[PDB]
């Protein structure tokens, strides 16, 4: 595997540092590495493809070295080189793709394809070099069993979930109390509603709570917390819990009272914030708990008083809410986020070549399904597959 | 400016000095050196040192 | 090339006038059929070379070394076939010959063999030196045949304890190599691929059309190859057969190692020299299997090796030119007569 | 051009690796490259500026080189160097800016300025070196006529468009049916409304559809699709299509029924998703088609039934919607996105120097206008201009 | 300080380029640099920790240099090396953290810890090299006094502020006129409301204005400007200015009329946009001014006319709004943004080790408090502390 | 590819300059080139055909050189030569045809056939020569990514479109107002009709407009513009817009009033002509806009007055029109025109060999369908295929 990596940084730092002009001395250290490769390869034979709509292609090697002679570089030098690179590019592409499709339950971590299995061979190890590409960097550290870690912008930790829970309801759905939410990606919006505006509630306050359990711990998270859930601030006609009928939600928004956000790790409070809106840091957590209340306004102007009568019908439904967004965070496990193309690359190659559903990944590499049941096997396969996608993107985008 | 003499007679002089001398530019030299004392002011006015 | 000083002294009237040298290339590809004549060119180009290759200097007194050699060598210890490893002498010469000889060979794009001497294992060790550098690519397949197998068998394999099945070769594709695929000691293992490669990276187009099959920066003065050739040697010290064997063998090996600090110097030397001289060759030079050889006694080789000090020699300016000048003329004549030739023939037809 | 690039990576890798102390043998390979430059330059004269409020500064070259001796670097060494760098910096800045304003209908892909035209000269090619900066990387691969590609977080593919289409309307605007939307940047929000709540519609279902045609194909897109269009979930007073009057929109939101998103390429469905909210992958498309329906609730509690009478006046307007956001994608053409400063750099330099409107770009480099009529000439000029901005940002931010 | 930097890029470019199988010559230039270090170190002893819960560990050096076994490294070579690296890693971590907690009003721009103060010593300068990490790059350029500059995605320039201003109000709060807003991070949403729908206003138009003063100038900003403030488009019950009662806000949204956005710098208009929604560039500004109007619709269908009577009660409250988001920008001062983990790293290390509140930073490194009173001392300390966090993240994430 | 080219100019300049008589000296430079070929070929083996009704043919090479001896040329010399040429001719034909049928979506630009793919090989490049054939000339310039350009007589830019638009109509179709047109090839004819002869129109003038958007920009166009649309000057019975009935058009022609032709490029007016009939130049445009009016004659003789009553029935229908023809123009993209046989050659070879419909081109290479959806893939394939047709026509017509 690491082998694979090199193959690319070789080509990149190649198709990059080798051009009509420059001095030999700037590539001397490079040129070498290169040749070294050609050698180890030549003589060997390969095979890629064979699954689904993926073409089968065989490759052989028999190439000349490089003029370690010249001082500067003349156009002619390049072209005779670029011609050799292009065969490797078109090669690697086919190599990546071939191993970017196969999955495996037992050992979903190690190589699969006839192409790569052959590379992990010892006789090729004579090629590793410059592993500064964030992903491979972490691939190694994990082999040696040590503390890994990646960086994500608007991570995708929450499987899509949009629902409600009626804590007080009745057939007519004319005096409900409960919460409704949307957990998706890196965002959570939750609203607590009480049709009665806490008219008969102790201290005229109704307590609400929303708990979200992450499938993986997030560390060093920068989070935006804002009062109100705009998504649940407008009139709605919703299906009843049993699907037998529809209820009416006509919200009027009040400020959430006694807001408390807790970021817990294994049941322990790691970070807690009381009514702090704006930017907050959650340094290590696997669970978020949002507690907030609706407090009936003790003093009301006529217009307000008119919305909240002492007796039904309750026509304006008191609602309080919160919005929480994880802007960035670090995770020890690979995840999809709003910036990296890994998930999209893997999903795209599989879709383009009509790769059949396998035993590990959900149909279509569906993110929600994947993160909902993020088993060790899915994670090992995902990491292998994401690391390969990242190796491929160094040359082919 | 400067120019190590030691490195000069080692390197082989790249007419760097040769040029500056030819073109007349303010410069310095460095290392072991043979001094030579004179008197009769004259010498000076005549600017022998150049 | 820093080391060399350049300067102008005389001026030039707008009266100045010369005649183009005319250095078109080959025009005639004799490289694919006129063996008989190539052999004659190579030879020529070769002698030419020796005439140039600077003579060496400051060597270690012949006597001194060979003497510490006997102390280390443990010569007469049972073994029947004595005084065959010391016909090494005349080194104050052998090295000079081995040295020159080696260059020209290369430059002149010649190919050769080896007055080899099976018994004399030392003479073999040094062989390993040779392949470590000189791109086997230009060594008639065969002389390499003997050499390697002699190493492979009467060395490594058994003293290293590995294939005590000594080695059976009929005629595959590179016996020296294959040894790799089945050797369990990395150090040993790198030598193998590098040696079986170092194919004399036959690809160059410099200073305007001068295909002069080049050579590894690595070798050049990255040298390490040597350092690695040594490190691999540093762990070949073990069992299998009689005592007077390992004792004698390894002791010799060490003389390569210590000296290794210097052996380095050798690499640099050639590196430069060839890499220098070459510059002034107009005639292109495709690698060809000459019809004739050139005997190179591991005798001399071995000498050069442990026998070079902090010496340092290079091509006298005047020397270099003289070289250019010649090839030049020659070329000019070749090209010219060619024209003179053609012209006639064609006329001869209409 | 590529020439230009070097000039910088030269200086960066310079103003970076040349500090009081470091060991020489870390810059040996570098130092060289540097000098090589000075040489090629010395003996040349340049001129930049001359347009609008851009000064016309003149430059000459005549510099000494750099020692090669010294195990380590002494302070003095640096300062005598930094002094030489600063003249090149202040130079390049002026060079970039001068070629970052001119546009040419014809060859808007070739060099313009007297400054650069002179660089493409052959005698300067001896300076090229280390082309690994993502942009130049792609500049080359294109000049050779090959497959390019870039990376963008929240790309800016949709020209601003905020409008509506009334499929059923009448003078009083008291019983409308149609859609309203906002396409902007990487986001689309669209709502379908039916004042009658499909009371007389076949199967009590009203079909809606929203089609968006991208000006450039996007590949490997990671997309968030969510039900509801919050932007169109509140009461509005809107201008009529003819601008003669204003209508009232009083939405009540229902879940979009039979949601189907199609990502098409040249009329062909490449990806299709049926009611899948959350994260989805669209691997290659030039068109997005969102189809969704409003289905009159077959069962209604009294409160709901009251909103939807059998006869007008229709006072609560049934609305269903969708929100789609392209988090990341790859495009073969340069585009503005939410992270890169290229567009802003080009636009800013032109604004600061009062550069007159030219024949290629819309006034003010207006993004909406640019992407709406993204002609080949605008793209070639944009790419040239974006690549220069990226070269400049390696040294000057 | 710069010293520190090296220590890492040394290790990274080390734990990266040093692997089982790479040719020696690909690290020749590197190996050296490394050894050079060991030397300078060995002998001197260090103290880290000694505050809050941070442990006081003692580090001592006694290491053998690095071999050079020729022709690609043998596994054995690595392991004997990795063993030495791991002591430095675990070291630096402790070094960073120790200087990442101390603050100082007077000189809070220099080294504090006994650990680092010792590094700035001259006898160590011999290590510095490859200063390409964006942050250190700017650390230097500032020590010499020049144009610094960083890059941010969704910068965090606006301290959280959510409030309103009633320009016309009365006890019953039944006919209000004013604005309400939310400034947070990189976003601003502002709404102007007039319960009377400008019935008695000159030209039936009510003018609104929202001014936001940045604590630091932003340059090269790419900004999204959209009409409407969704956050203020729904019914609300709000506390009165004096907290004595609550008022009712029942918005109906109209398009903002005569929208004008001005990006000012020191009172001067640098950029101005009239009713331009979508993507706009603000090249240099310290203030944003949003002016917009509510114009009573001159022509109204019956449904609309019914919302706006000639006399109270005013039951539908005319509202116009704007949304502005800074996608990216450059700032000469460090700031938190939506992608970088610096703030989170610093905040997290302090929280984990129970570091006591100091004299410079607000409790909990609270971003809003920090940016609200972004004094020179807080900025110098923040930059020092952010630069260290970035050095640490090269090795430990 | 370029390779291919040569093969021909070789043969042409051969079957042309080689004949019973002439002096050697006139072909010396030629003869050479020739031989050079034979060599490179000999030994190699080929294969063409295999698709549809196309025969499969294998070819081998083993030919003697040419007598570079003789002074003049004797009959015998020719015949021994012509015999060798004829094998190459019959060859190339089969080569062209084989690559003139295959299409490809992904890479529709590069070679397809086993025959050609082998030619792009490096070892054959030893044959290029004299690329003055207009098409190859442009093939190269496009590889180097530069400004191309072709020449066309009566170009074929307008997909066939013959229709009408009724701006005022009623069931009886007895008082219509609108336009009808025919856009086809290089010509546009458009008529504006008003059954009422602008009797109730402001200023007794009815405005008309016809806009045509080209799929590719045309530059340096020589255009004939004439008043009147003869095609729409006669009585017609036409199908109604909904196809449910037929209407009667009984035109009487008046001179078009206030004629204005605008040639726009990306929305900008590049050329504008006011009432100028005859020959006009449009130098660069992607859109043509024709505006013209029908002005009711202010003074009418009895015979005229009788045609235009104040009240219906309107029996003579006032009509004004324009005719525009693009005689010649330059386009950066290949197009069919009235002189070149490329489209016909490609279409003919495919039809003759019963080549199956592929994934790129419309059935039958239909021009209207092709130009209507002239995608990048269709253009790249069309150019490849047109360039091959042009190479073939140098030898086989
Ligand atoms: Zn964003």
CB contact under 8 A, B4 and D64: no
Instruction: Inspect the interface and report whether the beta carbons of A351 and D271 lie closer than 8 Å.
Output: yes
Whole-angstrom CA distances from D5 to D34, D71, E53 are: 14, 30, 50
Residue among E25, E68, E69 whose CB faces C218 most closely: E25
Round to whole Å and give the CA distance between F71 and F85.
Answer: 22
- Strands D58-60 vs D45-47: parallel, antiparallel or unpaired: antiparallel
Give the whole-angstrom CA distance, residue F214 versus residue F272: 17
Is the same domain home to D58 and D151? yes
- For residue D153, what are the CA distances in angstroms to A338, A341, D162, D340, E283? 7, 10, 23, 9, 21
Closest CA to A222 of F13, C326, E346, F349: E346
* Closest chain F C-alpha to C346 CA, distance in angstroms: 6
Residue D256 DSSP symbol: P
Q: Are residues A392 and A345 in the same domain?
A: yes
Q: Are A99 and A387 in contact (CB under 8 A)?
A: no
Tokens 């990514």 belong to residue: F145
Measured in whole angstroms, the distance separating CA E271 from the mean position of its chain's CA atoms is: 23
Give the neighbours of chain B: at least 3 Cβ pairs within 8 Å: C, D
Q: How remote is the CA of residue E186 from the centroid of ligand 1, in Å?
A: 9
Cβ atoms of E305 and E239 within 8 Å: the answer is no
**Token pair of D246 as six digits:** 């204003």
CB contact under 8 A, A67 and C203: yes
A–D interface: beta-carbon pairs under 8 A: 174
The nearest CA of chain E is from the CA of D246 a distance in Å of 5
Q: Tell me the three state secondary structure of residue D283.
A: strand
E2-17 vs E28-41: helix axis angle to the nearest 10? 130
Cβ within 8 Å of residue C309, ≥6 positions away: C58, C59, C60, C262
The neighbouring-strand residues paired with D272 are D262
User: How crowded is the C-beta side of A380, counted as CA atoms within 13 Å?
Assistant: 16
Do B and F share at least 3 CB pairs under 8 Å?
Answer: no
Do D220 and D285 meet the contact criterion of CB atoms below 8 Å apart?
A: no
Listed residues A328, A352, A376: the one ending a domain: A328
Distance, CA D265 to ligand 1 centroid (Å)?
27
Are D250 and D300 within 8 A, CB to CB?
A: no
- Rg for chain B, CA atoms, rounded: 14
Q: What is the CA radius of gyration of chain C?
A: 23
Q: At a CB cut-off of 8 Å and minimum separation 6, what does A394 contact?
A: A8, A9, A11, A12, A133
Q: How far is the CA of A153 from the centre of ligand 1 (A)?
A: 9
Partner residue facing A32 (CB), from C199, C203, C217: C217
CATH number at residue E388: 1.10.1350.10
Say whether both A367 and A225 belong to one domain.
no
3-class state of residue F326 by DSSP: strand
Phi/psi at D291 (nearest 5 deg)? Answer: -120, 135
Task: Mark whether D153 and D169 lie in a shared domain.
Answer: no
**Domain containing E147: what range?**
1-158+329-397
CB D40 within 8 A of CB D3: no
- Among E61, E57, E46, which residue's Cα sits nearest to residue E114? E46
Statement to judge: residues D19 and D83 lie in one domain: yes
How far is D197 from D319, CA to CA, in rounded Å? 8
> Is F153 annotated in some ligand binding site?
yes
Nearest CA in chain E to C227: E70
D328, D362, D383 — which closes off a domain? D328
DSSP F362: P
Q: Is D262 helix (H, G, I), strand (E, B) or coil?
A: strand
Determine the Cα–Cα distance for residues F47 and F60; give it in Å rounded to an integer: 9
Q: Could you tell me if A279 and A222 are in contact, meaning their C-beta atoms sit under 8 angstroms apart?
A: yes
- Distance in angstroms (rounded) separating the CA atoms of residues D34 and F174: 84
CATH number at residue A256: 2.60.120.170
Answer yes or no: do E116 and E204 share one domain.
Answer: no
Note whether D21 contacts E277, CB cutoff 8 Å.
Answer: no
Joined tokens for residue E254: 């109209």
β-sheet bridge partners, residue E291: E209, E260
- Which residues in chain C are contacts of E74 at CB distance < 8 A? 186-187
Paired sense of beta strands F45-48 and F21-23, if any: unpaired
- Cβ <8 Å between D233 and A237: no
Q: Two tokens at C344?
A: 């006639």
C160 close to C238: Cβ distance less than 8 angstroms: yes
Total length of chain E: 397
Instruction: Report the separation in Å between the CA atom of E291 and the middle of ligand 1, taken as the mean of its atom positions.
Output: 25
Phi then psi for residue D176, to 5 deg, are -95, 160
Taking residue A266's Cβ as centre, other Cβ atoms within 10 Å add up to: 9
* 3-state SS record for chain E: CHHHHHHHHHHHHHHHHCCCCCCHHHCHHHHHHHHHHHHHHCCCEEECCCECCECCCEEECCCCCCCCCCCCCCHHHHHHHHHHHHHHHHHHHHHHHHHCCCCCCCCCCCCCCHHHHCCCCHHHHHHCCCCCCHHHHHHHHHHCCCCCCEEEECCCCEEEEEEEEEEECCCCCCCCEEEEEEEEECEEEEEEEECCCCCCCHHHEEEEEEEEEEEEEEEEEEEEEEECCHHHCCCEEEECCCCCCEEEECEEECCCEEEEEEEEECCEEEEEEECCCEEEEEEEEEEEEEEEEEECCCCCCHHHHCCCCCCCCCCCEEEEEEEEEEEEEEECCCCCCCCCCHHHHHHHHHHHCCCCCCCCCCHHHCHHHHHHCCCHHHHHHHHHHHHHHHHHCCCCC
Report CA(D188)–ligand 1 centroid distance (Å): 15
Verify whether the Cβ–Cβ distance E237 to A254 is below 8 Å: yes
Contact between residue F326 and residue F304 where contact means Cβ atoms under 8 Å apart: no
Residues 6 or more apart in contact with residue D88 via CB below 8 angstroms: D7, D11
Instruction: Considering only CA atoms, give the Rg of chain D.
Output: 29
Q: Find residue F274's DSSP bridge partners.
A: F260
Q: How far is the CA of D342 from the centre of ligand 1 (A)?
A: 16
D21/E128 touch (CB, cutoff 8 Å), yes or no: yes
Q: Does A340 touch chain D (CB under 8 A)?
A: yes
Q: How was this structure determined?
A: cryo-EM
SS3 string, chain A, reads CHHHHHHHHHHHHHHHHCCCEEEHHHCHHHHHHHHHHHHHHCCCEEEECCCCCCCCEEEECCCCCCCCCCCEECHHHHHHHHHHHHHHHHHHHHHHHHHCCCCCCCCCCCCCCHHHHCCCCHHHCCCCCCCCCHHHHHHHHHHCCCCCCEEEECECCEEEEEEEEEEECCCCCCCCEEEEEEEEECEEEEEEEECCCCCCCHHHEEEEEEEEEEEEEEEEEEEEEEECCHHHCCCEEEECCCCCCEEEECEEECCCEEEEEEEEECCEEEEEEECCCEEEEEEEEEEEEEEEEEECCCCCCHHHHCCCCCCCCCCCEEEEEEEEEEEEEEECCCCCECCCCHHHHHHHHHHHCCCCCCCCCCHHHCHHHHHHCCCHHHHHHHHHHHHHHHHHCCCCC
Cβ neighbours of residue D144 under 8 Å, at least 6 residues apart?
none
- Tokens (6 digits) for F202: 């402001």
| E75 vs C contacts (CB less than 8 Å) | 186
Note whether D240 and D285 are same-domain residues: yes
* First vs last C-alpha separation in chain D: 21
A149 CA to middle of ligand 1, Å? 23
A 10 A CB-CB count for E80 gives 12
Q: Report the C-alpha gap between A279 and D127 in whole angstroms.
A: 48
Six-digit token string for D20: 């009081």
Residue of D21, D79, D315 to mutate, interface with E, max E Cβ within 10 Å: D21
Contacts of B7 in chain D (CB under 8 A): 67, 69
Alpha carbon distances (Å) from E175 to A61, A259, C96, C99: 84, 31, 111, 107
- State whether residue E220 sits within 8 Å of chain D by CB: yes
Instruction: Please give the structure tokens belonging to residue C151.
Output: 């190493």
Which 8-state DSSP code applies to residue F55?
Answer: P
Say whether D203 sits in a helix, a strand or coil: helix
Q: Of A35, A123, A126, which has the smallest distance from its Cβ to C201's Cβ? A: A35
SS3 for F205? strand
Angle at F93 between CA F89 and CA F95, to 5 degrees: 115
Mark whether F and C touch (3+ CB pairs within 8 Å): yes
C-beta separation of C256 from C263 below 8 A:
yes
Assess contact for E196 and E322: CB atoms under 8 A.
Answer: no
Residues 6+ apart with CB under 8 A from E333: E216, E374, E379, E383
Residue A334: Cβ within 10 Å count = 24
Question: From ligand 1's centre to the CA of E343, what distance in Å?
Answer: 18
Residue A236 · residue D251 · CB < 8 Å:
no
CA gyration radius, chain E: 29
Please indicate, yes or no, whether residues D273 and D199 belong to a single structural domain of this protein: yes
Do E141 and E164 lie in one domain? The reply is no
Residue of E nearest to A338 (CA): E339
Is F212 found in the same domain as F192?
yes
Do F273 and F289 meet the contact criterion of CB atoms below 8 Å apart? no
From A39, A68, A123, residue closest to C214, measured CB to CB:
A68
Task: At D377, give phi and psi (nearest 5°).
Answer: -60, -45
Show the tokens assigned to E32: 């050296």
Q: Please list every residue in chain A followed by a chain break, i.e. its C lies more than 2.5 Å from the next written N.
A: none
CB burial of residue E222 (10 Å; 0-12, 13-18, 19+): buried
Q: Which residues contact A167 (CB under 8 A, 6 or more apart)?
A: A177, A178, A179
Q: What is the dihedral of CA C333, C334, C340, C341, to 10 degrees?
A: 150
Beta strands in F186-267 (DSSP E): 187-194, 205-227, 236-239, 246-249, 251-253, 257-265
Q: What is the dihedral of CA F134, F135, F136, F142, to 10 degrees?
A: 110
Chain E CB contacts of C218 under 8 Å are: 25
Kindly state whether residues D67 and D205 are assigned to the same domain.
no
Q: Which residue has the tokens 């721009």?
A: E109
| Cis status, amide bond into A217, omega within 30 of 0 | no
Contact residues on chain D for A251, CB-CB shorter than 8 A: none
User: Which tokens in the block code for residue E370?
Assistant: 């920090």
Which helix (H) or strand (E) segment holds residue F291: the answer is strand F278-295
| Resolution as reported, in Å | 3.8
d(CA F199, CA F179): 18
Domain count along chain A = 2
Which of E284, E303, E328 is the last residue in one of the domains? E328
Pairing of strands E317-331, E251-253: parallel
Which helix (H) or strand (E) segment holds residue D259: the answer is: strand D257-265
For an interface test with C, the pick among A33, A44, A68 (most C C-beta atoms closer than 10 Å) comes out as A68
Question: β-strands D251-253, D317-331: how paired?
Answer: parallel
CB contact under 8 A, C2 and B15: no
Q: Token digits for D163?
A: 């409008």
Tokens representing residue E45 in the block: 């002893």
Spatial separation of the C-alpha atoms in residues F114 and A242, rounded to whole Å: 64
> Which chain B residues have a beta carbon less than 8 Å from that of C314?
none
Burial (CB < 10 A; 0-12, 13-18, 19+), residue F163, is exposed
Check whether residue E147 and residue E216 sit in a common domain.
no
Give yes or no for E344 touching A (CB within 8 A). Answer: yes
Q: Concatenate the DSSP letters of all residues of D288-307 into one string.
A: EEEEEEEE--SS--HHHHTT
Q: From the CB of residue C71, how many other CB atoms can be counted at a distance below 10 Å?
A: 9
Residues of A in contact with C202 (CB under 8 A): 64-65
Residues of D in contact with A246 (CB under 8 A): 297, 299-301, 304
Residue labelled with tokens 């009797």 = F199
For residue D101, the CA-to-ligand 1 centroid distance in Å is 29
B16/D69 Cβ within 8 A: no
For C267, the 3-state DSSP assignment is helix
* Interatomic CA distance for residues C62 and F277, integer angstroms: 107
């Amino acid at each position: 595997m690491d082998v694979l990596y090199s193959l690319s940084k070789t080509l990149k730092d190649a198709r990059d540092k080798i051009v009509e002009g420059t001095l030999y001395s700037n590539v001397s250290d490079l040129i070498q590495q290169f040749n070294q490769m050609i050698i180890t390869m030549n003589g060997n034979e390969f095979q890629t493809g064979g699954i689904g709509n993926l073409p089968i292609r065989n490759w052989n090697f028999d190439f000349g070295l490089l003029g370690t002679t010249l001082l500067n570089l003349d156009a002619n030098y390049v072209e005779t080189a670029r011609n050799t690179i292009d065969y490797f590019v078109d090669f690697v592409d086919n190599v990546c793709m071939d191993e970017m499709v196969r999955e495996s339950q037992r050992n979903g971590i190690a190589p699969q394809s006839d192409s790569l299995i052959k590379l992990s061979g010892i006789k090729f190890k004579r090629i590793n070099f410059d592993n500064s590409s964030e992903y491979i960097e972490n691939w190694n550290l994990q082999n040696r069993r040590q503390r890994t870690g990646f960086t994500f912008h608007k991570p995708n930790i929450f499987p899509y979930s949009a629902s409600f829970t009626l804590n007080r309801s009745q057939p007519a759905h004319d005096n409900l109390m409960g919460t409704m939410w949307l957990n998706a990606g890196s965002e959570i919006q939750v609203a607590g509603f009480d049709y009665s505006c806490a008219i008969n509630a102790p201290a005229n306050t109704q307590q609400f709570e929303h708990i979200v359990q992450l499938r993986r711990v997030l560390t060093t998270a920068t989070i935006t917390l804002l009062p109100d859930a705009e998504r649940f601030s407008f009139p709605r006609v919703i299906t009843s819990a049993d699907g037998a009928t529809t209820w009416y939600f006509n919200p009027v928004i009040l400020r959430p009272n006694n807001v408390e956000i807790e970021f817990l790790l294994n049941g322990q409070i790691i970070n807690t914030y009381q009514a702090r809106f704006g930017t907050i840091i959650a340094r290590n957590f696997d669970t978020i708990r949002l507690s907030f209340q609706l407090m009936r306004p003790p003093n009301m102007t006529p217009a307000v008083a008119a919305l909240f009568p002492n007796a039904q019908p309750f026509e304006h439904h008191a609602t309080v809410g919160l919005t929480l967004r994880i802007e960035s965070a670090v995770c020890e496990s690979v995840l999809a986020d709003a910036s990296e193309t890994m998930l999209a690359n893997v999903t795209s190659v599989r879709q383009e070549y009509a790769i059949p559903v396998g035993p590990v990944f959900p149909p279509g590499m569906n993110w929600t399904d994947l993160i909902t049941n993020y088993s060790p096997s899915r994670e090992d396969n995902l990491q292998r597959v994401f690391t390969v996608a990242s190796i491929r993107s160094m040359l082919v985008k | 400016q400067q120019i190590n003499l030691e490195e000069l007679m080692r390197t082989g002089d790249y007419a760097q000095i040769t040029n500056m001398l030819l073109n007349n530019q303010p410069v310095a030299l460095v290392g072991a050196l043979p001094f030579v004392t004179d008197s009769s002011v004259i010498s000076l006015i005549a600017k022998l040192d150049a | 090339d820093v080391n060399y000083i350049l300067n102008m002294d005389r001026n030039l009237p707008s009266t100045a006038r010369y005649i183009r040298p005319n250095l078109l290339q080959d025009r005639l590809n004799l490289h694919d059929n006129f063996e008989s004549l190539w052999d004659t060119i190579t030879t020529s180009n070769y002698i030419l070379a020796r005439s140039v290759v600077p003579d060496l200097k400051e060597l270690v007194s012949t006597e001194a070394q060979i003497q510490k050699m006997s102390q280390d060598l443990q010569l007469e210890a049972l073994t029947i076939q004595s005084e065959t490893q010391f016909l090494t002498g005349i080194n104050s010469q052998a090295a000079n010959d081995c040295f020159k000889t080696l260059i020209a060979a290369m430059l002149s794009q010649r190919t050769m063999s080896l007055d080899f001497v099976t018994t004399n294992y030392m003479s073999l060790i040094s062989g390993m030196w040779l392949l470590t550098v000189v791109p086997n690519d230009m060594f008639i397949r065969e002389s390499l045949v003997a050499c390697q197998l002699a190493i492979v068998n009467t060395i490594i394999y058994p003293a290293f304890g590995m294939q005590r099945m000594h080695y059976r070769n009929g005629d595959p594709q590179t016996p020296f190599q294959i040894a790799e695929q089945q050797i369990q000691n990395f150090q040993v293992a790198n030598w193998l691929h590098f040696v079986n490669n170092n194919q004399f990276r036959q690809v160059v187009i410099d200073g305007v059309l001068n295909q002069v099959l080049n050579d590894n920066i690595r070798d050049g003065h990255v040298i390490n190859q040597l350092m690695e050739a040594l490190m691999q040697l540093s762990r070949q010290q073990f069992p299998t057969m009689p005592v007077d064997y390992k004792r004698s063998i390894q002791r010799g090996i060490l003389l390569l190692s210590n000296r290794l600090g210097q052996l380095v110097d050798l690499t640099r030397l050639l590196a430069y020299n060839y890499e220098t001289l070459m510059a002034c060759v107009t005639m292109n030079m495709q690698h060809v299997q000459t019809l004739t050889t050139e005997k190179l006694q591991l005798t001399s080789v071995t000498s050069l090796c442990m026998l070079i000090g902090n010496a340092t020699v290079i091509p006298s300016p005047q020397t270099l030119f003289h070289y250019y000048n010649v090839n030049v003329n020659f070329h000019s004549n070749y090209n010219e007569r060619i024209n003179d030739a053609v012209a006639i023939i064609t006329a001869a037809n209409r």
